[PDB]
Structures are given as structure tokens and as C-alpha cells.
Design an enzyme around this catalytic site. Structure first.
Site, short mmCIF file in Angstrom:
data_model
loop_
_atom_site.label_atom_id
_atom_site.label_comp_id
_atom_site.label_asym_id
_atom_site.label_seq_id
_atom_site.Cartn_x
_atom_site.Cartn_y
_atom_site.Cartn_z
CB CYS A 194 2.32 -57.25 35.78
SG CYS A 194 1.46 -58.59 36.46
CB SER A 195 6.42 -59.40 35.98
OG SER A 195 5.97 -58.90 37.29
CB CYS A 196 2.07 -63.06 37.28
SG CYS A 196 1.47 -61.48 37.64
CB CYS B 109 2.65 -62.10 33.50
SG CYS B 109 1.48 -61.10 34.44
CO LIG Z 1 2.67 -60.34 36.26
#
Ligand SMILES: [Co+2]
Ligand SMILES: [Cl-]
Ligand SMILES: [Cl-]
Ligand SMILES: [Co+2]
Ligand SMILES: [Mg+2]
Ligand SMILES: [Mg+2]
Ligand SMILES: [Mg+2]
Ligand SMILES: [Mg+2]
Lengths: 227, 202, 227, 202
Positions: B110-112, B107
């Protein structure tokens, strides 16, 4: 927004800090656990955020020096604070005063309350989720296999159109259906669902590089134009 | 602090901690949250969920060719049937590693990551180095993990820019004749389900 | 390098901190003055850097969190340290040990030395400068008024080709002459001078925005291709 | 410091100070620098140079049309003839503000600025906010400085990506009939020579 968060293709961030999975602790401080509970507990009730769009833009608005230093769950605290004040759930000055209380006296007792109905409500979010899939009456502009060119756009609000993918030729890999549109929803401007596509990009097009690499990116219809 | 340069001074971590407590304090006082609501979340994401759910899916796909084919043809229906569905796991797709195709998931923005199937993301998955580099120099990044692919293996990097999520289905290693489904699951690493490792033969 | 330093077109850095010029102090700490003396004093003698190319890449290599927090002259200290160790003028371990000395005892006395010949040598740099203009036998590829397209390249080393200007149509405004080529010189790979051009870009091409704005950027020949 | 997250922890300013002194210490001990060499630099950039050099050039261009025309036709030759030449001022170009053209200068990639003519850059010139924004939203940036241009004025932003440097020649304000060259120089602000201000009528 062309912000610090949009890092794909950047240089200088260094080596990946590998850790064996069994050693990769989730939480080292209780406030990090609390951050998780604040985010899911508020989102489950639509407080400050109805889904992840509003959540993300609060993070992307952080000061770059904070984004890079806060640690991960600091991002989460920042966006909860941002969104609850923006929607009028919390007052800014009250939040600042209370923050000062806990800065000066960290051991200040936290009020206790049991609310089993709220527990069940939070459980429903956790298990039922928040799918952004919708239906719209329009037909998709693009088809699987079509060559598209991604737009030269620079939203100053939230977007899911990474900079490294802008002004690029790609090929439609799948038409997912219409999904809530982040660029509007993050700002509380309506779901305004738009067709979402997966799009393949080749390394030579992305970077001018020579290896057998590609990137699959999910892009909303308005990010792209036909060729 | 020189007021020309406020942006040089980060919030200390003590601030984020204080602000978290202030949020908690205010929200509980105003009746928006409860102690048990917050605990229930923490229990779920620190303890209930984890990569063993994905491991079980991988081991079932390795054992049962009919299940594997269904999983790859319509992973959302299959995964939901198994109960691996929920917040951040409403639309999970499975991407199959093959001898000449290696999949890696990121991601960048972000961090998905699909919590209902894999639990929480690795520390490094959320941080800039991996996120920035893996889309551009995935071979270099994978070498840092100990995975040195031949130039003839194609790499597909999947950037999680929507709410669609991606799990990698790694190949079953050699040397696993006679190993049961339950024992095979124990071999499936978290990292193999992101694409940053293959499975070692036992 | 696609690094933190290359900020043009980014969002989220906030308001410009205006200060009246008469109040805009140059130096608030003596170490900042010292940074200036270290940079010019070393460059005047070709120690760690012969010009600004080597200087800049040392700054661009900083950890992003340091780049954003060190303050300006911290950048200068970082690049002097980097370049003197890279060229073998200073030993890394000796520099670390000495840095520890001054961390633990900040009032440690600085050795004094007068060298009037070195003063004159430094003065010559200051007044004679380091012009990067050269001559080469090749002719310019581009001409004033020509429409060019800037390349999709992503040097992992130093470059003066800002990301916001890549994959853009522009118009040659002036052919300056051949200048030392930063992408090689920063890495001590030779002056390898190349024609330098000023190129105008319109706001609509850069951003898709609608105002009467343009950007003039100086670009080396290898950053561009004909149309 | 958790070793997964070293990148969250900036060097403190005490480190940069210590490192500066260590560099100074080592370089003087090894005979590469001297106390007086370092002082000579500091004197030059904190005291000798400054924006009054550019001010004098602007006031001369306002007073002497023949000089102005020469300056704009070949500013490098002219400026060097005047003695405004040296390190980071080897190739200085002058860009003329007109009623419908406003020039603004930046170094998006760092802080480049023509020290021999203007002295050291403003604090804000070197920092991310100005550098990032002025190329994209110059009207918004100029409004923060108190300069609100009509939509019909064209803005040219000059990004100092090479060693070529740029000075803005601002227009002489109204209300300056009878004012001598020397007095006009006193009206020329640093900020007007970067393009972030016009000159106020006295
Ligand atoms: Co993310
Ligand atoms: Cl595999
Ligand atoms: Cl003007
Ligand atoms: Co600069
Ligand atoms: Mg095989
Ligand atoms: Mg996605
Ligand atoms: Mg007039
Ligand atoms: Mg230039």
C-alpha cells in the site's frame, strides 16, 4: 487476498516517476483533502473502522481497474464508502442517490456544522495514535536467529503476507511482541493478537538473483513454520 | 458498456469526487462529522506534519553521538520523548546507513509511511512502479533516482508490512565541518530518509 | 515477466460474466475484425512475428492499465504495433502521425488493394499452421511419473512458467517432444527447442487447499529440476 | 494528465481503433497487406470456423466406440485425418469426462484456444475473472455456470501454457436412445467442450 494491490516482485509497471521533493505537491483537488478528513475523522470515532486493518481490506477489494485508475485518494474514498455501508453506518441506496446528486450538480452546497468537541476527539487520535501492540499469555514460537520457512497459504481475506515472500526460507531478525492480527481484525473478527516478527530474506532465496540485496519483512507467527 | 465487460470501464475521477462529497454530506447531516473536524485533519497532514521533523532527528544524530546511540538502541522511546509520535507513527524504527549497508524503505502492499516523523509519502512511493520493483531490483530503482551503488554495497529493503514504520538515517556528507545542527537539518532531504538518495556535500 | 497478464490464482477479479453461447457475439466493432486480419496477415508473412511467441510478449508488455481496459482485440493491436516497430517494418513516428490522422478524421478512406497471391499465402498459414514441434539430439531430462520441483526463477522477459506454479512439486504426465522455447523465441533469440512436458500439480501443493482438484500445466524442461 | 500519474490514464477505445486503421493504412500502402487478405482472415474466423466441428467429433465419439478409442489414444492423428487442423490447432488433445473425473480448460496467461476445432473462444474465457479463478477454485467457478459437482468428483484443470490445445469430450446424456449422430451433434454445446457445462438430457 492475492489481489492487484500485492505488487511486490511484479514486472511491467515501468519507470518510477521521480520528482524533486519541493515540487511533489500533496493535493491537487479538494476532494483529495476531503478524503483524508473522512478517513481520520471516521477512524477517530471507530466509524466503519477501528484501525487500519478494516481500512486496508476496503482498498484491496476495489475492482482492479479502479485500483489502478482512481488515484491514491480514490482508494481512500472507496474504503470509507465500503466500510461505512458494511457496518450499517450508511445505507447503500442513500449513498448512491446522494452520489448522483453531486454527479449532476457538483456545486450542491455542503452542510456546515461546528463541533469543537469532535475536533478535540479527532486530535486525540492524531496524537495518541492506535498502537496495535498487545500482550498475550503464550510464548513466541520462534526466536531471533532461527531459520523459518514461510507457509504456502492463500487467504482469500485480508493478509499482510505478500505473495513474493511465500514458500521462502528466512531468518528471524526480531520478535516485536504480539500485535493485533490483520487477517482477523480486518474482517471484524477480533483483535486476536499474535506474535509479530521481522524476518530477513536473501535475494537468492526470493528471486534466484545474484546481487547483495535482502528484504526485511514483518510477518505474523501464523505465516511461518519451523525448519 | 457491454455487460460482458464492465471491468474494462474504470470509474472516472468525477465519480470519486462526487462520492467524497456524498460521504461528507451524509456524515455531517447525520452528526458523525463536522466541518471543523474535517478541516482539522487537513490542517494536520497538509501543514503541521512534514519531513522537517525527521530532518531535525537526523541533524541531532549527526551532531550528538550519545543521542545517535540512544536513537539506534531504542528509537521508539527516543522519538516519543521528542514528541514525534501519533497516528501511523506509534512504532518507528531507525535504520542506519553505513559505508557498506544502504537501507531503502517501501510499503509494497500500500503506502505505509510514518506520518508523525516524515509527513506524507512521496507521490511515487504510493504507486506500483516503485512498490513492485524496489524489492526485486533495488539497484535499478535507485539508479532512476540518481543513486548508483557499487556491487559491494549491500542493500537492505524494508517492507512495511505491519504497523512498524522505518526511517533511514543517512550518513553526514563530507564538507560539513563547522556547520551547525540547525544548518545541517536543512541539508536532510525527504528522499534520504526513505533511502532513495544520499546527501550531497554542500 | 511477472506481469499483469499472469493472473492464475489471483483474487478480486470478481464473477465470471456468463452468457449463453448463442448470444456471445464475436465482434461488435469493425476494428476488432481488422485486428484479427492484421495479426494473421502479418504472421503468415513473418512480419513482426514468425509465430505466437513474439505475439504474446507484445501483449504482456502493455501498460497494466491498458491491458485491463483495451478490450481483448486492443491487446492484438498493441502487439502488432509493438512488433512491427521493433523489427523495423514500421517507423514509430510515421505510425504515430498516421494514428493522429485517424484520430482527428476517423472516416479517412482506407487504401484498397487486391492481391490474390497474398490471399493464398495467408490461407496456407491458416490451414497448415505453425507447429512448434522440433527434434533435438539431447534426451529428455525427466520421465513420466517422475516427481520434479519447479524452479524459483523470475525471467524479466517472456516465459510460459506461471507464477502460481513456481517452487512446486509436480509429477511428469507426458513428454511431448522438443518445442520451440518461448523464453528465447519471443525475443528473436532462436528457436532453441527444449523438451516440453505436461505436469500435474495437486491443489494441496498449489494452494494448501483441500478439495479433489488438480492442475495440468505444460512446462519446458528448464523450468524444472529433479528431486 | 499530471505527469507523475500517466499510468492512471488508459488509452481510450478510440485510440485502439485509430491505431488499427493506421496499421492497416500503412501496411496496405507499403504492399505488406491487401484488402482481400484482411477480409480472408475475417471470413475464416468469424464464419468458417466454429464449435460445430468439435460437436461433430463429440457426436462421432458417442456413436462409434472404435472412433472414440482411436480419438483418445491419438487425438492429433485422428483430428488431422478429419481435417480439423490449422493455425492454433496443430496439436489438439482430447480429455474425457467420466463419472468421477471432470475436465476444465483454461489459458491463464492469455486466451489460447483450438480455433480449427472450436472456433473463437468465449468472451469470458479471455477475461481475468475466469482465468484467475478457475485454477484455484474451479468448483466455485463451475457453480457460476450452473454446474455444481459433488465433492467426490475430481476436477482436472488444464492450463494451455504451450501450443498444445485441449478439448473436453463431455459424456452423452441420458434419454438419447434412438437419436442419430447428426441430431446428437446438435446437442453438443460449446461450453461442454471447455468443461464449464455438462450436456442436459433432451
Ligand atoms: Co502502506
Ligand atoms: Cl547515506
Ligand atoms: Cl460431461
Ligand atoms: Co492464451
Ligand atoms: Mg566515512
Ligand atoms: Mg512494517
Ligand atoms: Mg453412466
Ligand atoms: Mg498447453
Amino acid at each position: 487476498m492475492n489481489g492487484i494491490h500485492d505488487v511486490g516482485g511484479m514486472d511491467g509497471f515501468g519507470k518510477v516517476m521521480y520528482v524533486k521533493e519541493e515540487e511533489d505537491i500533496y493535493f491537487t483537488h479538494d476532494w483529495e483533502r476531503l478524503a483524508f478528513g473522512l478517513v481520520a475523522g471516521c477512524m477517530a470515532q471507530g466509524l466503519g473502522m477501528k484501525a487500519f486493518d478494516e481500512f486496508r481490506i476496503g482498498i484491496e477489494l476495489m475492482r482492479p481497474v479502479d485500483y489502478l485508475t482512481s488515484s491514491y485518494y480514490g482508494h481512500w474514498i472507496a474504503t470509507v464508502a465500503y466500510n461505512l455501508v458494511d457496518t450499517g453506518v450508511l445505507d447503500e441506496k442513500e449513498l448512491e442517490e446522494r452520489t448522483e446528486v453531486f454527479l449532476k450538480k457538483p456545486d450542491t452546497k455542503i452542510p456546515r456544522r461546528e463541533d469543537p468537541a469532535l475536533v478535540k476527539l479527532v486530535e486525540k487520535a492524531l496524537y495518541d495514535g492506535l498502537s496495535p501492540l498487545r500482550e498475550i499469555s503464550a510464548s513466541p514460537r520462534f526466536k531471533v536467529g532461527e531459520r523459518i520457512k514461510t507457509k504456502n497459504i492463500h487467504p482469500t481475506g485480508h493478509t499482510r503476507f505478500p505473495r513474493y515472500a511465500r514458500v521462502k526460507y528466512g531468518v528471524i531478525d526480531e520478535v516485536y511482541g504480539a500485535h493485533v492480527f490483520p487477517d482477523d481484525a480486518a474482517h471484524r473478527k477480533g483483535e486476536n493478537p499474535q506474535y509479530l516478527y521481522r524476518v530477513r530474506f536473501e535475494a537468492e532465496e526470493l528471486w534466484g538473483y545474484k546481487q547483495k540485496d535482502s528484504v526485511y519483512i514483518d510477518l505474523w507467527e501464523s505465516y511461518m513454520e519451523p525448519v | 458498456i457491454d455487460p460482458r465487460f464492465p471491468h474494462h470501464h474504470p470509474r472516472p475521477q468525477s465519480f470519486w469526487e462526487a462520492r467524497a462529497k456524498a460521504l461528507e454530506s451524509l456524515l455531517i447531516e447525520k452528526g458523525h462529522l463536522s466541518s471543523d473536524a474535517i478541516e482539522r485533519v487537513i490542517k494536520h497532514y497538509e501543514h503541521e506534519l512534514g519531513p522537517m521533523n525527521g530532518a531535525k532527528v537526523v541533524a541531532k544524530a549527526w551532531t550528538d553521538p550519545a543521542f545517535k546511540q540512544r536513537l539506534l538502541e531504542d528509537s521508539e522511546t527516543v522519538l516519543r520523548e521528542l514528541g514525534y509520535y501519533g497516528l501511523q507513527g506509534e512504532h518507528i524504527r531507525v535504520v542506519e546507513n553505513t559505508d557498506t549497508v544502504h537501507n531503502v524503505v517501501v510499503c509494497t502492499l500500500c503506502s505505509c509511511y510514518p506520518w508523525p516523523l516524515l509527513g506524507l509519502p512521496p507521490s511515487w512511493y504510493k504507486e506500483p512502479a516503485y512498490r513492485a520493483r524496489v524489492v526485486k531490483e533495488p539497484r535499478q530503482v535507485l539508479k532512476e533516482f540518481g543513486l548508483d551503488l557499487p556491487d559491494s554495497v549491500e542493500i537492505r529493503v524494508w517492507d512495511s508490512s505491519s504497523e512498524i514504520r522505518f526511517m533511514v538515517l543517512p550518513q553526514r556528507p563530507e564538507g560539513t565541518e563547522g556547520v551547525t545542527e540547525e544548518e545541517l537539518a536543512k541539508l536532510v532531504t525527504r528522499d534520504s530518509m526513505i533511502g532513495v538518495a544520499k546527501i550531497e556535500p554542500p
